[PDB]
Every structure is written in C-alpha cells, then in structure tokens.
Amino acid sequence: AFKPPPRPDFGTSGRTIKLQANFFEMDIPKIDIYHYELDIKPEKCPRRVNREIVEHMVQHFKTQIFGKPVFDGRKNLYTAMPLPIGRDKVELEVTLPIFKVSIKWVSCVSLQALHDALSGRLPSVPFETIQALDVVMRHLPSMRYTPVGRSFFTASEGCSNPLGGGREVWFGFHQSVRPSLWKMMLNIDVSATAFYKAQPVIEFVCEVLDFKSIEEQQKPLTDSQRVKFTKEIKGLKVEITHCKRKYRVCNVTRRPASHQTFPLQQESGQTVECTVAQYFKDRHKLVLRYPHLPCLQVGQEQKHTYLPLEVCNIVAGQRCIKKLTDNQTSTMIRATARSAPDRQEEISKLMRSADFNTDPYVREFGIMVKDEMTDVTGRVLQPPSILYGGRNKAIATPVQGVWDMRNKQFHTGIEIKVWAIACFAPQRQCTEVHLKSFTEQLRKISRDAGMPIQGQPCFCKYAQGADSVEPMFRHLKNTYAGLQLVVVILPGKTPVYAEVKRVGDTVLGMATQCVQMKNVQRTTPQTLSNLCLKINVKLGGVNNILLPQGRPPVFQQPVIFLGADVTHPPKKPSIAAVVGSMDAHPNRYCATVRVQQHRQEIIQDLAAMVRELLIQFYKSTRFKPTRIIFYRAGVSEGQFQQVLHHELLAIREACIKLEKDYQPGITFIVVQKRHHTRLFCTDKNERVGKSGNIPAGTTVDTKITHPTEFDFYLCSHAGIQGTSRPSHYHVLWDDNRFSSDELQILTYQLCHTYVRCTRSVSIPAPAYYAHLVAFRARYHLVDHQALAKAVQVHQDTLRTMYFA
RNA sequence: UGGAGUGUGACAAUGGUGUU
RNA sequence: AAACACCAUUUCCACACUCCAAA
C-alpha cells in the first residue's frame, strides 16, 4: 500500500485517430540550476512587491553578484549559473521609492537527473525540479501579465470586447510544466473572464448610467443614479491624474463637488470648512469641468478624503465579481467555451503571441518550447452492445456515444398497478387538465418502454408546505395496499423536496419520483422517457444490461465494482458515499453512506462500508468476489499518497475481518474530470457534431501521460457543447494485473451502465452513482452521532437505487 | 425537481501566523 | 473585538448555458 504500479503495456484496441493535445514539447539542457533561499523582512509583503524588491536587488547589486535569476514570489530563487555565495547567510539592504533581504544557498537541481528520470534510468521524477522549471516559466508572466489564481490574464491587443457597464472581457491562460514519457512538456489551456475597463471614472459614469456623453445631463444625479453608480464603484481602485497615487473607493458623496466640504487643516490654525471644488481650484490650480457630479470617498471615513470624478481613472487589472446581466453572460459565453476547433486555434494563437522562445528568462536557462501542439496517436474503443429485453429483445448499438429505445423495451419491465399523485404546486397554475394529460402521456410512454401503467392513480390531491409531507405519506402507506410509486409535482426550488426525499428514502422507504411543474404542463416524449428510466430503476427493475457475451474476461469470475465520492459542507459534518454492484450485469447497485470530519476527503469508515457492500453482494449473488474494482472519485494528485495509504488498507482490512483469509485482488482507480488537458482531432473530417469534439471512446495512454505509472485519458462521452473534458484515470493499485486494453474497455463499458439515460457518460457508473448518493444524503441532513443516523436510509430503500 | 454535456467562482471558506 | 496583509489547505457546491420536442 505504498508504491503505485508501473504501466504494464500500451493499448492496441480500437481504431486509431490522429490527435493533438494541448501539451507543448520542451527542449531542456543538461545544466545544473542553482537554488537559493531568500529571507525578507517584513514577512507579510505581497508576492508582487517581493518580485519588485528582487528586481531592484538584481540591478543594484550587479557589481557584486548577478554577472539573470528567476523568482517564486516567496523566498525561493533560482539561477542558471552559480554566484559568489556559500551555505552561510548573506544579508543586505535595499530601498524602494526600505527592506532587508537575506540570501542563503540551499541545493543544486540537476537537469541531468531529470533526463535520467525521463529515460529508463531513474524511476522517480524529482518534484523540486518540476517546481523549479515551473517557477522559471512563470517568472516573466507573473510580472508582465495579470495573475489570477494559477492563471495569467491580460487585455485584448486590438478588438476590445465590451460587456456594458464598466466591464470588458479579458482573456488568459493556465500554464504548468508536466513530465512525460521521454520529453518534458508545457501544459497550457486558455480561458476568459470579466475585468473592469481602464477608463476615466467620468466615462465609467457614462457607461453605468447609460449615458452617450457626460454632457447629456448638467443636473446632478438623482438618488437612484447615485445608488446605482455607488453599487458599481464601491470597492474599486482608482488612480489620480494631477500629480499616480492609487486609491480605493469606499463610498460616493451625496452632495456635488461644488458643495462637498471637508476639514482643510491649512497648516496651523487647524481646520476650516472648504469645498472640494474650491480646494482643487486653489491648491491644484484646477477648475472642475463637471462640478455638479458627486465625489469619490476614499480611504478612511474618519479621514474625510474625497475626489472629483474628472481626476480619477479606473486602474486596469481589476476582475469583476458583481452579478452579470443577460447580455453580459451571453456575450461572455458567446466569446468563450467555443467549439473544439475554435479553442484549438485560440491555444495556437496564444502560443504564437506569447513567444516563450524570445523571453529573456526562458532563454537564460536555454529552454526551447515547440510552437506547435503535440501530435498524439490515440485510439477509439469499441462501444458495447446494449441488450434490451422486450418481447423481441432487440439490441441497441451506441452510435457516436448515444442510443435509443426505439422499438425496444426494458430488460426487466415493471407493471405499475398502484401509484399516487401529490401536487404541491398551486392549482391556479396547475389545473386538473394538466394532470390528466400528463397522466395519459406518461401511461403511453410507460407502456411503450416496457414499464406499463396498468391504470389511473389510486390517489390524486393538491397540497402545500413541507409539513404536509410526512403525515400524508403515512396515510398513503396505510391506505393503499402495496403501492409502488408516489409522484410529487413541485413548483420549482422548494424545501418540500428535501423533506420528500427524507421521509421517502429514510423514514418510510417509499419509492418517490418528483417532477417539476413545467414538465406537467407541457409534456415531451423524451422527458417522460428518461423519467420512465428513473421510475423503472427506483422500483427495482432493470432498464438495460451489457451484452453478457460481450464483456472483458474479468467477468469470468465473481467481481464487485465500487464507486466512492465525498461531499463537503458550505461548519457541518462531511459525508462520504460508497456504492457497490450487486449483480453480474452489472446493473444493480447498493448504497452506503457515512458522516465524517469537516472537508476530510479521506474516507475514514470506508472499511465498514466495504464490508456491508461485500456481505450484501454475497446475499444477492451467492458468490464471493474474487476481484474488487474501486473507482475513487474526487481526489487530486496531491492527495494520492494519503488516500491510497489509508483507503486501500481499509478495503483490505474489510476483507480480513469478514471471513478467514479471504483476500481478493484490489484495483484502486482514481477518476478525475477536473484537469487542464484538452484533445483535438487532427483531421477535420474526424470532428464530431457542431462542437467538433473527439468521438466518444477516444483513448490516450501515450506521450501526454505519466512516464512510468499506470494512467490513461478516456473521453467516454460525446461533446454536446464547447470542448470535451476527457476523464483521466490513474491506477494507484492493481493486484489483478490488468492490461491497458482490458481496463480501458472495462471502464468505457461501465460508462454505458448508467441507468438514467440512453447515452455514454463521462465517468464510470459507480463513481457517478456514488456522487449521486452523497448529494442525496446532502438533502437528508436538511450532535454528530445524532445526524449520523439521519443518512441511514430505509430497510427497503437500501435494496434499491433510490439515488437514481 | 426528465437527462446529459461544459462555462464561470480563486478580493472564495477555514485554521494559522502578523499588523495603526 | 473591525477591517487589512500573508502561509498551508478546501474542485466541495452554487449559478448559468447548450442539446434531446423543428426539418
């Protein structure tokens, strides 16, 4: 439970399709770079200030040292060539129009060892080296561009994209140095956001108050205009233009600049009441062109510092946080999240205009970055045949990641005979005609799907308030003998839903299916169809199964599939969810949920949860799992060592405390949808749909993947909009010795066992379900050992997929 | 609360050190 | 205790959009 397994082989299954990844090949020398620790007092200075101080320190000490270093922004410094130092601390002083800096030697970072790591020589890739390289590549844009989070943003060179108000669209990119099979690469992905336009505040007023010009009104702002302008500018920073000095607007004056007064404190004799306009006329010899406009209150309210709008400009680099209107959000997405070819060209254009090969700090370390994206082979896996079981038992073949139930019926359809209707929406906007039409349409779609509604509902009443839920359900459960479903019509976002699921899933164990109000008024066969999918699953039926004869050889022996996800509170306990397959299809899943420490992603009580699932598996299959496939979802790379250490043992522990010496093979896999890796089709004819993304089933385990360990990218879904995010799978452990092809096909096949739609999903079904179970348990909570029993679902609910 | 996809948040939340 | 800086963590969740209902 310490070391992750090496990649066994390279996959050869599926049709090859020429691809390009957003990785850029780097040429790195064999030179050893020198690392030094800095010590700067005071110890609270911002990163930008630190880089500024170091920059001054470089040029002012050229006679002694620096015969061109890079900086972290925080106490870490690197140089290409060595300098006159030692292990001893070298302290000096600098001045910025006053700091004390101490430079200390740390260690040497050899890039020869990096080549040994990328080659077959050394197994471990030095993290300190990756850090150093990343600091180098980020040193210039950290000062040249505007850093946001881990990305760098900037304005537009030519065409300035506006948004209205004081906002505009700034574009940016996220860079990161990553190790590869043979050569180091630079991962880069573009993005966009909204910044405040660098313009005079007098024009900011014009754009906010919808003025063509400022001379449109000579009369002062009405109270509504003052509030509106204040709402937009309160908090922003502005620079002055009659001396430079940057200020922060805390408020907007009520009175005009001609009447706004303040304590003048003219040397001796203390304060005299003076207006702002008179001050700028006397002191700065400036007559106000627009004295009828209010002033910007700056700094401390006790300080009484005011500024006329015509001497203030809004400083650039200020990202917007305010709510975006319809036109703003539209223009945003109408300029971002574009199609795959568009994003592709954007990254290419970026890599062209960024010009890493001409920047001095990059050239200093003799680093060369390829200006073209990395070509990668890639291969599209073969979609599994989905077997439906009507009278004809037709088969659905996933075309482009999507299939349908046309002339097809469920593998195991349930004859719904007893069901109820409880509408919580007002009857005024939801008539009985709507309910009957919805009933007719549902009955038709249901019977066509293989899950026939044998007749009208035994119950149909309007209601209101969450307090009506728990009592009514009890009455419903005691009145009608053997009801199968309770349909709850909701008028939108309401606390009613949470209690419906609480009473339904935990308290009584009644199969409930909520429907939004609008879908009852106007009904489309597609919506009702997907709804039927949910119902049939919630009632214990089987929508569809994988083709038994068309499965990887792992199914030849009893194997259980596990999915795990963790959800954290907005101080409240977190909840971890672990699901497990309960048949050999694998269609049916059982859910286990626990409560945990705040924001602890490491599943603590996992062992007991696995034990429950294993026992339940045996009770449902009469077979003991020879294999365990654990799809962990939600953890990042920085948590791997921790998670893999505890959770793997927790799984193994559960297998020991259960029965004798029963130790099946555990395959620990980490699913990751959140990463800056993009994939594009090289051939224009290979593009799929409007979005023009890679075809569903695209598999990549070369060039852009880990040099030694077992990982692979798998785009298992078809891109509906924008650019697809290929789900990354990293095998942290494997006792069963899976081959690349087998595990990838198995994963891609489990992406077809999703029961809520007739499509291929981005992540495997167990991981998706586990996320659903967690997010469902989120509603059950709405003192620790008390709420611990709140997530404990019903006895009869346990044997079902309520989370669907 | 029919479903899937992908955009935004990073002056975010907390515990920590520290400031007139 | 009120703001304000910085260090290590937290991709949780929220909102929005697109498509399945046209030919």
Swiss-Prot record:
Organism from which the protein derives: Homo sapiens
EC numbers: 3.1.26.n2
Keywords: Cytoplasm, Disease variant, Endonuclease, Host-virus interaction, Hydrolase, Hydroxylation, Intellectual disability, Magnesium, Manganese, Metal-binding, Nitration, Nuclease, Nucleus, Phosphoprotein, Repressor, Ribonucleoprotein, RNA-binding, RNA-mediated gene silencing, Transcription, Transcription regulation, Translation regulation, Ubl conjugation
Catalytic activity: Endonucleolytic cleavage to 5'-phosphomonoester
Effect of residue 598 to P/A: Abrogates RNA cleavage. Binds siRNA
Binding site for a divalent metal cation: 565, 633, 771
PANTHER family: EUKARYOTIC TRANSLATION INITIATION FACTOR 2C
Chain intervals for the UniProt region annotation (Interaction with guide RNA): 279-284, 492-534, 673-674, 717-725, 754-776
Entry protein name: Protein argonaute-2
Membrane spanning stretches: none
Subunit note: Interacts with DICER1 through its Piwi domain and with TARBP2 during assembly of the RNA-induced silencing complex (RISC). Together, DICER1, AGO2 and TARBP2 constitute the trimeric RISC loading complex (RLC), or micro-RNA (miRNA) loading complex (miRLC). Within the RLC/miRLC, DICER1 and TARBP2 are required to process precursor miRNAs (pre-miRNAs) to mature miRNAs and then load them onto AGO2. AGO2 bound to the mature miRNA constitutes the minimal RISC and may subsequently dissociate from DICER1 and TARBP2. Note however that the term RISC has also been used to describe the trimeric RLC/miRLC. (Microbial infection) Interacts with Epstein-Barr virus (EBV) tegument protein BGLF2; this interaction participates in the regulation of cellular miRNA by the virus, leading to enhanced SUMOylation.
UniProt-reported outcome of changing residue 637 to A: Impairs RNA cleavage
Gene3D superfamilies according to UniProt: 3.40.50.2300, paz domain, Ribonuclease H-like superfamily/Ribonuclease H
Gene Ontology MF terms in the entry: core promoter sequence-specific DNA binding; double-stranded RNA binding; endoribonuclease activity, cleaving miRNA-paired mRNA; endoribonuclease activity, cleaving siRNA-paired mRNA; metal ion binding; miRNA binding; mRNA 3'-UTR AU-rich region binding; mRNA cap binding
Gene symbol of the encoding locus: AGO2
InterPro entries attached to this UniProt entry: AGO2, ArgoL1, ArgoL2, Argonaute_Mid_dom, Argonaute_N, PAZ_dom, PAZ_dom_sf, Piwi
